[PDB]
């Protein structure tokens, strides 16, 4: 029994929460450097991420994750992810062999090429390949709304402004692993998200996390 309960409303900072990455790179598909001054608080109580250009061809994104680790229970986020080919915005649990565990993780992914849908997809001890594509029906980039994911021992079901929308049921994640949200432009995978031209600044926003236990 790890991280409780939380309600993040991202209106001020406290040690002891979270953590930007910084100066590095995560390398293979993700095509920039996390930088710390990329990821802002706002006055209204927004955490917004953005991915900017420092000079020709070099790209500067951001990531902030939780420093405690959360296992099952409903994960939910209202946020509003950028538009652009190339990108992608996203949400997501998080450990692996850097935290000295096995790779589980859950996704939600907004893909920048096409912002009417989102991505879920899911790695179990490293075996991912489940991802399901659905269309929202509206353009999420253009206003916040709620994702969810209720992570169970038998299950994974995903909902879209409180809609269920997906579930999965076979080889759930069991590990539990670190809240994490980020924004990056791929190299190495067009056929995924599309390919990057350069467009910045772009931002993504965020502006609460919850988590509710069991
Ligand atoms: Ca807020």
Redesign the pocket.
Known sequence: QTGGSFFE???SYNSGTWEKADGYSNGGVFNCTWRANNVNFTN???LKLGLTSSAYNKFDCAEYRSTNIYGYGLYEVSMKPAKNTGIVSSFFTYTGPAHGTQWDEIDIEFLGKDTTKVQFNYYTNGVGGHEKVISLGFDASKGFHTYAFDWQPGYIKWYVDGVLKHTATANIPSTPGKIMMNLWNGTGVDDWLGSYNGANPLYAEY??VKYTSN
């Open positions: 409303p991202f209106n209204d109580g927004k502006d609460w």
